[PDB]
Amino acid sequence: DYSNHVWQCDHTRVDVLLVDQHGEILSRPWLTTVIDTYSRCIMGINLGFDAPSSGVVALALRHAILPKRYGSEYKLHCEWGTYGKPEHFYTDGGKDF
DNA sequence: ACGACAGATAATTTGTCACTGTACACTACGCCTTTTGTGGAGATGTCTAATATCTACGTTTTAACAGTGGCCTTATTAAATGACTTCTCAACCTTCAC
Numbered sequence: 001d002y003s004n005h006v007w008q009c010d011h012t013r014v015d016v017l018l019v020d021q022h023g024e025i026l027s028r029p030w031l032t033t034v035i036d037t038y039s040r041c042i043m044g045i046n047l048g049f050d051a052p053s054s055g056v057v058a059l060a061l062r063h064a065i066l067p068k069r070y071g072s073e074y075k076l077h078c079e080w081g082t083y084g085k086p087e088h089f090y091t092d093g094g095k096d097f
Numbered sequence: 098a099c100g101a102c103a104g105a106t107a108a109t110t111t112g113t114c115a116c117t118g119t120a121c122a123c124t125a126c127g128c129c130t131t132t133t134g135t136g137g138a139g140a141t142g143t144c145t146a147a148t149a150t151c152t153a154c155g156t157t158t159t160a161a162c163a164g165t166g167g168c169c170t171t172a173t174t175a176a177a178t179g180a181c182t183t184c185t186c187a188a189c190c191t192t193c194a195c
């Protein structure tokens with residue numbers, strides 16, 4: 001019925017091969033998204049090599065629930081003015097969830 | 098008129114065969130996460146019979162001695178000894194003898 005009423009979360013394998021800072025191949029990361037079902041903002045993400053795990057879920061949840069701050073190395077013109085807790089959380093059946 | 102006989106005729110499917118688009122190019126049941134009932138110690142808590150100890154229960158044994166009980170004959174006369182008691186503890190005069 002309103003914003004934050006149901007957040008939704010899932011993970012997927014990003015389709016970019018990453019590299020170490022020394023330049024050698026690192027297998028693709030996983031991306032986790034937390035999404036407002038009303039508003040349809042993306043509320044927060046976690047991007048990393050760690051497989052789908054409750055610590056990864058918790059890491060996306062932290063970013064989503066908390067206010068956002070980014071420095072000038074992020075050349076943003078907008079601002080990611082979204083925060084606050086969900087009232088419900090809607091997921092698939094993964095063992096992390 | 099319309100439609101109604103037997104047969105024409107535009108479909109409809111059955112069957113040929115030259116052509117071409119494509120896979121074969123090895124390269125998923127495998128990586129990763131979570132729950133979970135079974136299992137191995139290993140610190141810790143549980144709580145007894147029992148072989149004493151550890152005095153007392155008091156109970157025997159001793160000897161000391163205290164009390165009861167039996168026995169013990171009694172007389173006279175003499176002696177020795179030691180004592181006791183009582184009594185006594187004059188004094189002047191006369192007479193005849195040298």
Ligand SMILES: [Mg+2]
Nearest residue numbers: 010011092094
């Ligand atoms: Mg999912």
